Design a protein around this nucleic acid. Sequence first.
RNA 1: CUUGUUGUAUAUAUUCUUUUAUAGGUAUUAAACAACGGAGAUGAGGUGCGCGU
DNA 2: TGTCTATTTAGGAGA
DNA 3: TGGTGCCACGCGCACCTCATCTCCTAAATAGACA
Length: 738
Amino acid sequence: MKKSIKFKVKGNCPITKDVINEYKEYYNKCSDWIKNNLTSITIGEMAKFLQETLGKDVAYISMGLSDEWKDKPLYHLFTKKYHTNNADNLLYYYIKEKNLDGYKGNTLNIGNTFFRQFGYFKLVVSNYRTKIRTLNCEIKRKKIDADSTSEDIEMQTMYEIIKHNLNKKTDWDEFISYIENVENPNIDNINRYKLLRKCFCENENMIKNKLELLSIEQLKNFGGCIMKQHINSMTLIIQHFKIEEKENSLGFILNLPLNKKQYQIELWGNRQVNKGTKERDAFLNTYGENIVFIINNDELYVVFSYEYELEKEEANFVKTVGLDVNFKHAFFVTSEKDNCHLDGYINLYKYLLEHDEFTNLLTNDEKKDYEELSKVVTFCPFENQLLFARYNKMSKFCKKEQVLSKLLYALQKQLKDENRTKEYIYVSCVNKLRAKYVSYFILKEKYYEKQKEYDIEMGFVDDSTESKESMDKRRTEFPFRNTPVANELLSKLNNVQQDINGCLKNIINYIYKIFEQNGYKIVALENLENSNFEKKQVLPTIKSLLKYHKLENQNVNDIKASDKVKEYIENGYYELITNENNEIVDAKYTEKGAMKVKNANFFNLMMKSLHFASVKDEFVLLSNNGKTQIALVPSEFTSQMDSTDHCLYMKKNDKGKLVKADKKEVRTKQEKHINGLNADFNAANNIKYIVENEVWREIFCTRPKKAEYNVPSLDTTKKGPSAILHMLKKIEAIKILE
RNA sequence: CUUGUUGUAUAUAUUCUUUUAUAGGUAUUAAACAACGGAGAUGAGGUGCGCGU
DNA sequence: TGTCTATTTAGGAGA
DNA sequence: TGGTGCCACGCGCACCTCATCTCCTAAATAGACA
Ligand SMILES: [Mg+2]
Ligand SMILES: [Mg+2]
Ligand SMILES: [Mg+2]
Ligand SMILES: [Mg+2]
Ligand SMILES: [Mg+2]
């Protein structure tokens, strides 16, 4: 397979930001024409024009006037059945004969072949291929009543196939049995899905054809592929260029055709391609025609590609370990009791408990929970509530955060003194990660505050909704992103997130090398794909407490609102500024309510900024060269199933039916599972079981294929609670709860 | 050219920064450890703010 | 009369 | 479900994560300049 190496240009280069901007504008004009004619023009018309004017007996004109494509619209060139080069040539020479992109050359006089046809136009065509070949549909949900039109119900069945992935009839049968068979079902939700399931069977193929028709019909409203204003990149493909080792140096030289002559661009050396290594030999003998110019941080970089041989190892199944990912007490918990057998490993929870100062702050049960976690093999102590004590100064966890931080930094300095580099790097990165997330949160909140200030200041008066044109033009003419305030905040946020990513990579590398050193052949992980959880608790804001809640002119003495609104009013969250007649004119977030809003934002943003569903990607990248491999398992009911029986907990019903027990019934406390273990130790030991048992490995995990770059040795196709729950029942992996 | 990017110092000084404050900016001192397939686009989501309901 | 660099073209069913 | 601990509709303007796909070629000829 082909890899990449970046190089930094050492001197001055003709490639400036203006050249790249001109390239980008040419991209935009070409894509604008393509989007304006994606269905209006036919392939046969373009081919006929070329044959009549230029008059060539070439294959790209013969295939365009063939009967397969003579009548079809322009977007069929981007489908995977049409010949790639033939479609490129037909489109390019039609646009060129017509001058449809307004091309008048370029500033550096770069060879028009290497700049226009095989540069921006080639990227445009390759982008429009991705759009067409993965064409989707956009349907807005709607509640269907008992007496509703056929068109409304027909659309909603297509909607449910799009979102919930209901292809086969078994997909519907599992989904209904997942929704139905649970304590306290929602009758309204089941009625809609049953109606749509009935409709799906009667028009199943018509649904699959109307989906395609609607996708093609929506392509008219497509805005086209647009090269963003923040790109600062340019790709040229040149068949004949040269890369030579610079004599008496560790650098390289790029000989490039620039305005009918040869230009030389000097490149800094790269430790990925060193003089005595085999990677320099592979790079220098197998590089490709791809050349990238990118301006990152006001500096020019050059990218290339080259071939390489991958010797990634196969799975072994001799010693496996699971791993759950959490946020409340530990970042990573394995499925292995710590018994002073792993080498290079240090227990930070078994370090915290050795100090009397920390345990004295612990209540009797909390102390037992920490002593519970300290026997497992854990990593990177993250404390969601203790960390928020840094921002919320009037908190109840403040003294615990101070002691935790002090002990952690003392351990860091001690490890630095004793020359234990891997452990020292790990501890320092844990400290820095905890510190940097708070900075990220502060910067995000400031961004929100400044945006609100700017919007209220502008005072956008718009005539009507439902259309952008009716609204004030200033709302599009002067958006908040343009002002200088927004740019500094985003720069600071990007820097903080970069630090976070680096620290996380260091921690994961530590974990992987610990597992690799002792002879663990496979590491199993959850298949995490979403981390954008909804903000499940947002207090009714000032606008929403007076408009949607209709509390604007009600009575404080007699509040005609919801029970939850009564709960909120009873506590001091709000400041109702009533008038002389006890009519509310304004409402203000008090200190308690504002702090609650900040807390909700803090925990919601923690899921994303720490890249919850991307640590398996780091483990895969480390598994590309290492001896330990990676297995991805479905992340359903792993923190809801017994690790000592490998069974689910299902209770009876009022009708005597076995249904699914609530997730909060097998989980009394968030740290304990009813089986008498730690839930993270339970969840990680569930994860290991799929790999451990040959039966479950074949049932849930895909067959081991050839080793590939960024590919787990074991992966999963099934995605969804209904899919996993259905398979769990069929193998009798179920026990009856009390 | 003892050479690229990113992470790692609770390191020295600062009438620096609450818009990174157990951290950064600005200017120094030091050491190794590690990872590195790049570009663009499209799509699905979540979240912020304003105008309406 | 070379001597380098830009620039077309690349299939398919049909036979 | 997973992470926590359970949550309003339209129009827009912006920022983030995560998934997926394209693409990384070679020969032969035409032209620019002496
Ligand atoms: Mg988990
Ligand atoms: Mg940094
Ligand atoms: Mg867990
Ligand atoms: Mg660097
Ligand atoms: Mg470095």
